[PDB]
Write a sequence for this structure.
């Protein structure tokens, strides 16, 4: 019985190949998550069919309804058997699905439009108007937002830290809304809002966007917290321990480091 | 029912108190792992007693009679209920004991005494002028043993067939050997321990190059035990509340007996 | 019996004379390969007539009907007795035709128009800003096709699936394309040809980085022919007498229409 | 029928292992030629046992008796089946044995004791008393020699170039003799003659010795000529074509340059 491997469409994890209109099957995609799924199949022998969720969401729980959506939602209710995607290991998610050991480390970062060079011996320096989340929350001219139905949104929603509490209170009562429906939408908003918008996304995607043309964006400060990407699996499934052992084996063998290096730094420019 | 907690005497994870001869019970111990155990017990609601593994070894197999020794062998043979300590999550251990989600990231680093002709691990392996060894009966020696990369294979082949014994018993012995070898010996050890050592008196060592790989410390328990899910949930909740970062800052940088 | 010698029109190996219309026979050709053929004929004692291969290709297989084309195809199908030309010694060719000892060393190089953001081949492969291609129906495209290294596999995958046609018919076309693309196209070709081109007017190109590999030019003959041992001995004697170096200096650096 | 793979004892081609006393067989040696023989065995399946020639010579033909000696000699008279070693492809050698395609390029170079650094703002410069072979032949204070019963000695013996002819004329009538019996002997004489001796040897050995401690020797000028190392084989044997094909396959596969890099520059002690 072939199981379906759900995934999100987020660079560089899963892409669309240049010659993909004529291609079909698991050969339409490329990136980090496709290599991860290939190595998982190599470790434990099974047939897998790549899939993209209908709503293109990572997964959240709607209030007053308690119906999960996105990748997590479609994995819980049984239309998929695994989720090999950049899914963040979360406490609320852990109670509904099974997460393997993290295969990549990450953190919440801040992305802003890259400031221009300062002429005033004839040396150049970078002057960023934001250097940390605290001063980001202190000011009120730069608007900041996150990805809707994501993990950062829930992290800010259920946070007791003072700075994150102020950031969440500002976010939930902003007109117009500061939340974006896609990472690409947030990056485009950052690039196009004349340096007046800051996007809070994961550090891996932040670095990937920073290393690609036209590279007019940069990351300020450090990670707000530390998390990891895990391979999700429905509760009480036969695939949990095998994929966990496969992740550990790939980490020991250096496959994960090689894939990260070849998908993040080898193909960069500028 | 009192839960027996096994752990190793490692700084700043578990250390003896200044006047520990007077206190008794769990009040004679201090450190990052003690606070982590206290938070876990608060989350779960059990009475725990701290114990130190009889042999100062984390975990290894005899390789001839398939006998585990150390904290892992303490857990496998029913002598302990949980191992809250800097126990690295590895493929060999995961098959015998149950691990939780990582509570701290780490890696293999290089520590030398205070022009840096070594940079990364490649130059250290290529240059035979300076000696290098790891801790025995640990996750570093077992990592270099099974490594299939040319640089780490060369390093392991040198280390195993090296005279005299390039391995040390405890990481304190490795630190003392590095401080005493006068730039001739390099120590390979966990990154977090390297930072803690380099940020302490008399600040005669530094961490050179980058991390060789990325691993984590997991809170271990016997396979199939009823505590694994509660401790995993406790670790996740502690990570999300930001108290793990608070504990790391408290035990790593809040003291900081160095100028950096 | 007159020996038919096949060769390609390549500078400075075989070139048409300035007033070749007036002369006839072998007197209308000049170059390194012409002098090499003259020396070989002197050593062996045979009357030879120079011919140019009908199709301006060195040697390749159709890959679908197993048909050889070029100088190798000329030798295989009995149309020629010897191939004194810059024919690279390769595994595929050696199985079908007989080669002699190399008479000149070479390698795969990179040629760009006159800060060098490319250096070696690794940065050329990683950086997709600048395009790069080789000569079709030659030993360079066949080298990149069969290469099992990651960098060369990536380069080949880019080159084959490249729009428009990144391959050129003759190396003169590739040189003109490099001079015309204005720093956007890089050419991969033999090292000796690269030096000869870069040491010629108007000196608008240079050879960047090191050689990708090391190969040689061999004097080819049909498999089992009676000429293989005498031509191999002639090549060895010419190498030991130092006249091959003399010919290379005469046709490469003696003229030297550049300031270096 | 197991064939014998004869080899000379030279570095970094074939070197005795540090713990070579208790070991026996083909495990007593390490270096470049052992890896080359292993790859040759892998390409074409056959069993081989490494051996060292009795006289420790590369091979030359004498007068009167006209009896070949060394590796070439003991390969011609049938007590060896193949010579995987740094054997130079020579015209006189080719008429008695079969030579494969060269697996490594080389040339005759000059090795001298490294001069002391010059005091003269406070920059250091290296000055050498010899910069070419012509300048080496012009002077008389610095003696120079080669290896007895080698390819370089025969190259100088039959040379017709004026500089090489005069160098040979000086060599044949020098008291005491300037020739050495081993490459290590020549290097020791260079290091002990306090700058009054120059050794002419192959470029590969010259670079290898230059890259090893105490690194008090240097190479001056450039290669006098161009030659190559080939795998020898008795005339008319059934092994010439397979070893030639193996050499070509190894060269195209990138094994040869990988071995050269790992045995020449991977252990630079200076
Ligand atoms: N350098 S990285 O982000 O690509 C990366 C990150 C990680 C890797 C491996 C790599 Cl290559 N493995 C670890 C795993 C190994 C064992 C210890 C923690 C988990 C189980 N998780 S991780 O710390 O999230
Ligand atoms: N900053 S740190 O090294 O003290 C650190 C490191 C880590 C933390 C939390 C902290 Cl504070 N949590 C993560 C865990 C949280 C969830 C996602 C990955 C594991 C499960 N592991 S981690 O990436 O190893
Ligand atoms: N200096 S050069 O490129 O013109 C050059 C290059 C070479 C020459 C001779 C010259 Cl002059 N001879 C050798 C040959 C001689 C004997 C040893 C190797 C082959 C057989 N091949 S080579 O190493 O390819
Ligand atoms: N760079 S090197 O000296 O180790 C080296 C030198 C040579 C190599 C391969 C290497 Cl790696 N192969 C060539 C061979 C390939 C084909 C062309 C000439 C012979 C047959 N001989 S070579 O030009 O003598
Ligand atoms: N990776 C996150 C979504 C991205 C974000 O929230 O920034 C998740 O799995 O929920
Ligand atoms: N802390 C490691 C051992 C330390 C080391 O090997 O450097 C473990 O749990 O095995
Ligand atoms: N001279 C080469 C072709 C030139 C090239 O491919 O660069 C040959 O004999 O095939
Ligand atoms: N390699 C040479 C000997 C070394 C030398 O003459 O320098 C040979 O095979 O004859």
């Amino acid at each position: 019985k072939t199981v379906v491997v759900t995934t999100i469409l987020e660079s560089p994890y899963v892409m669309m190949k240049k010659n993909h209109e004529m291609l079909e099957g698991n050969e339409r995609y490329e990136g980090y998550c496709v290599d991860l799924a290939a190595e998982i199949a190599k470790h434990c022998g099974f047939k897998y069919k790549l899939t993209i969720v209908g709503d293109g969401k990572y997964g959240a729980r709607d209030a007053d309804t308690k119906i999960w959506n996105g990748m997590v939602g479609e994995l819980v209710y049984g239309k998929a058997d695994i989720a090999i995607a950049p899914l963040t290991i979360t406490l609320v998610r852990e109670e509904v699905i099974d997460f393997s050991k993290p295969f990549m480390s990450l953190g919440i970062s801040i992305m802003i439009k890259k400031p221009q060079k300062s002429k005033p011996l004839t040396v150049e320096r970078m002057v960023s108007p934001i250097e940390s989340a605290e001063d980001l929350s202190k000011q009120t001219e730069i608007a900041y937002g996150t990805l809707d139905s994501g993990s950062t949104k829930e992290f800010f929603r259920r946070s007791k830290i003072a700075v994150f509490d102020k950031m969440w209170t500002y976010m939930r009562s902003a007109e117009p809304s500061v939340f974006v429906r896609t990472t690409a939408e947030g990056v485009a908003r950052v690039r196009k809002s004349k340096g007046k918008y800051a996007y809070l996304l994961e550090s891996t995607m932040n670095e990937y966007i920073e290393q690609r043309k036209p590279c007019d964006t940069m990351k300020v400060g450090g990670n707000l917290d530390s998390k990891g990407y895990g391979i999700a699996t429905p509760k009480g499934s036969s695939l949990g321990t095998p994929v966990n052992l496969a992740v550990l084996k790939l980490s020991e063998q250096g496959v994960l480091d090689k894939l990260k290096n070849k998908w993040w730094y080898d193909k960069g420019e500028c």
Q: What stands out?
A: DSSP finds ten helices and 15 strands in chain C. The radius of gyration of chain C is 19 Å. The longest helix of chain C spans residues 228-241. The longest strand of chain C covers residues 108-113.
